[PDB]
Structures are given as C-alpha cells and as structure tokens.
C-alpha cells in the first residue's frame, strides 16, 4: 500500500480512460443510431462519423501517449 | 496506511490477581490515509456504477445489450464486495467501505430493475 499513484497506475489510469471511452463513444453513436436493422444486400443506416472519425483518433491518440509516457519515463535520470 | 500524528504516555496501576502493579504505556496515535482505498476500491466501484448508468442511454430495444451490460455490471459489483472485504478482517458490523459497496449495488440492481419493468 502507498498514498500515491505509481507510474502503473497512470498508464492504467490512461488505457483505463481509453476503454471507458470507447464505451461512452459507443453510447454517443448509439444515441444517433435511428434504425435497428442492418444493411442488406428504404434506407439504411450510414456509418457514424463518430466510428469514421474514432478509427483514426483513437489509435493515434493512444500512439501520441505511448510516445509520451515512454519517453517520459525511460530517459528520466 | 496511517501517518503517526503523535504519542502520548500514561502511568497507572492495574491491579491483577498476583498484586498491583504499575504499568506504563504509550499511545501513538495513526490516522489513515485512503488514497489507496480509493484507487483500489473507491474508484473502480463508482466506474462501475457508471457502467449501470450508461445501460440508460442505449436504446430499450437492445434486450440482449442492456441484459447483458446490467448482469455485467452487478456480477462484477458483487466480485468486488467479496474482495473488498477480503481486504478488512473477520468482524461482524458493516463499515464505511461496507456501506458505500451496499449502496453501488443498490444502484446497479436497481439499474438491472429499471429495465426490467421497462421491458
Ligand atoms: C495489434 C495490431 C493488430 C493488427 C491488425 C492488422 C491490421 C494492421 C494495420 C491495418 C491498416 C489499417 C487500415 C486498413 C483499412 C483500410 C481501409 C480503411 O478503412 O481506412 C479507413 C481510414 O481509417 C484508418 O485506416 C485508420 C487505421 C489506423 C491508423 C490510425 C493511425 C495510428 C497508427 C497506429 C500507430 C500508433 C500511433 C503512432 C503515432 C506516433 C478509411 O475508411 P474507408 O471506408 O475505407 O474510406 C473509404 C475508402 N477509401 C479509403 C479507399 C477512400
Ligand atoms: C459525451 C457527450 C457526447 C459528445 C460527443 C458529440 C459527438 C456527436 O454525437 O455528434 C454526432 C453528429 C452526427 O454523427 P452521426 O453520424 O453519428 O449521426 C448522423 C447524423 O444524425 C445525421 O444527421 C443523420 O442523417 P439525417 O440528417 O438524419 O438524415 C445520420 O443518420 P443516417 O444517414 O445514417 O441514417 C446519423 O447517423 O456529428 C458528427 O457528425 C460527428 C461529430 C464528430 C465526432 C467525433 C468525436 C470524437
Ligand atoms: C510523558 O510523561 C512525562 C512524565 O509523566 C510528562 O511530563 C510531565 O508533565 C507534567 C505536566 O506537563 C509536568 O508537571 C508540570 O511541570 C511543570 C514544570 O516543572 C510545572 O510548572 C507544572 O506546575 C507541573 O508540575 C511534569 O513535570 C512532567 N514530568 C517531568 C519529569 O518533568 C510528559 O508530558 C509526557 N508526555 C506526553 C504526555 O506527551
Ligand atoms: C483503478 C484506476 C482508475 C483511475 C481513474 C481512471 C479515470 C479514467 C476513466 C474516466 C474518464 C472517462
Ligand atoms: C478520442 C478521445 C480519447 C480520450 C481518452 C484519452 C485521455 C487522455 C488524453 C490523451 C493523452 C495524450
Ligand atoms: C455516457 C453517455 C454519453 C452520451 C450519450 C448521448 C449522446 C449525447
Ligand atoms: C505497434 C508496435 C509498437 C512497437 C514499438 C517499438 C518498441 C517495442
Ligand atoms: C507505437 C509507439 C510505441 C512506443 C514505443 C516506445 C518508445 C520509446
Ligand atoms: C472518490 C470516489 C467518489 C468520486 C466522486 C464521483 C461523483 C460522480
Ligand atoms: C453524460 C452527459 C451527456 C448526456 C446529456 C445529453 C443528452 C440529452
Ligand atoms: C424480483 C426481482 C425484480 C423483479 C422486477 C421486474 C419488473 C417489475
């Protein structure tokens, strides 16, 4: 036990953060999602610009911080 | 844990069966500290506790997913009882951990329930 926040943790913290909102991303395009049925091979419903725009964000955020953290901490003296 | 805030000492005579004798002791006194307890405990129950509440937000229609995200989430609210109180001794009253554990599987059961009678 100890009263502070390893290095563990933040990056636990951080992926932690990411997961959690991969769900509230989910929710968000679940809000907007007006139709129930799939497309087929009447109207169908198109993509999310919020998955189109996540499939980028997401990783190259989660990339950005790996670079972050891991700079950070393996060259720290 | 704790973080030592002070010591005191007394002196006094116990009387026992084999005469009186003095005894002198010395309280230091520990108050706690629950970071700890927070991310370890704390925490991942109110992260839980949003899971229940995001099963509002999807739609009704989805049995399969708010069924499934509600079990999930009260399961998982009971495995972390049992290891939160892993965590504290065999003693027969609840505590404060023990109440805030309680009231998040109020919320998740009632989350669970609240489906129920929508459905
Ligand atoms: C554990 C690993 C698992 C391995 C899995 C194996 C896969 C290996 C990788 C496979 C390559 C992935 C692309 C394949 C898909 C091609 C088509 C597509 O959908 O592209 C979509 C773009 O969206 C993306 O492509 C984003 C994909 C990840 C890149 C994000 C950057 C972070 C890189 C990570 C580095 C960390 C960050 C580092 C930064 C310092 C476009 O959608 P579309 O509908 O197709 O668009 C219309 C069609 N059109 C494109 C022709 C116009
Ligand atoms: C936390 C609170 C939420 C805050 C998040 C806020 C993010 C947010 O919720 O916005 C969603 C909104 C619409 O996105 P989305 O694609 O999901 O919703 C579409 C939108 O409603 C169109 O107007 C609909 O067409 P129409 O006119 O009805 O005919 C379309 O229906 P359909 O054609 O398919 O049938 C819907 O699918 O804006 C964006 O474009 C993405 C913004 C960038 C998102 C990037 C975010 C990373
Ligand atoms: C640890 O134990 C010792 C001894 O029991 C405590 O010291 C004692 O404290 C009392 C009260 O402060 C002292 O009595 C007072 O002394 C002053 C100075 O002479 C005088 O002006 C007062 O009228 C009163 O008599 C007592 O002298 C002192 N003991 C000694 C040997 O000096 C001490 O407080 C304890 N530590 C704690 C409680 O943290
Ligand atoms: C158990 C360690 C968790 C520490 C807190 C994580 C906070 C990130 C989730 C919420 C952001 C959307
Ligand atoms: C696309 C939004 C992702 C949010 C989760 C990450 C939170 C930390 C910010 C990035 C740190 C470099
Ligand atoms: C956790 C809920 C995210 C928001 C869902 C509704 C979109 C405004
Ligand atoms: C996606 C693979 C990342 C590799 C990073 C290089 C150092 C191990
Ligand atoms: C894809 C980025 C991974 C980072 C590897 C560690 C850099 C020191
Ligand atoms: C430290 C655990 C409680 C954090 C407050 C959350 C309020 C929604
Ligand atoms: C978590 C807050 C976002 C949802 C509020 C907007 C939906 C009406
Ligand atoms: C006995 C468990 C709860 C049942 C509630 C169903 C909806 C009225």
């Known amino acids: 036990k100890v009263a502070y926040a390893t290095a563990m943790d933040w990056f636990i913290a951080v992926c932690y953060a990411f997961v959690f909102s991969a769900l509230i991303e989910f929710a968000t395009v679940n809000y907007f999602t007006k139709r129930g049925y799939a497309?087929?091979?009447?109207?169908?419903?198109?993509?999310?610009?919020?998955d189109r725009?996540?499939?980028?964000?997401?990783?190259?955020?989660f990339g950005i911080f790996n670079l972050v953290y891991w700079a950070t901490y393996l060259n720290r003296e | 844990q704790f973080s030592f805030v002070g010591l005191r000492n007394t002196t006094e005579v116990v009387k026992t069966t084999s005469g009186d004798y003095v005894v002198?002791?010395?309280?230091?006194?520990?108050?706690?500290r629950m970071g700890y307890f927070t991310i370890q405990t704390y925490i991942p129950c109110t992260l839980i506790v949003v899971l229940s509440w995001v099963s509002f937000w999807i739609?009704?229609?989805?049995?399969?997913?708010?069924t499934s995200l509600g079990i999930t989430t009260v399961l998982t609210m009971t495995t972390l009882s049992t290891i939160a109180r892993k965590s504290l001794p065999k003693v027969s009253y609840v505590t404060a951990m023990d109440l805030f554990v309680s009231v998040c599987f109020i919320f998740v059961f009632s989350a669970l329930v609240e489906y129920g009678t929508l459905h």
């Open chain 1, 39 to 50: 497309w087929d091979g009447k109207t169908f419903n198109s993509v999310s610009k919020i």
């Open chain 1, 53 to 61: 725009l996540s499939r980028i964000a997401f990783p190259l955020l």
């Open chain 2, 59 to 66: 739609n009704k229609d989805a049995v399969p997913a708010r």
């Open chain 2, 24 to 32: 002198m002791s010395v309280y230091f006194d520990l108050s706690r």
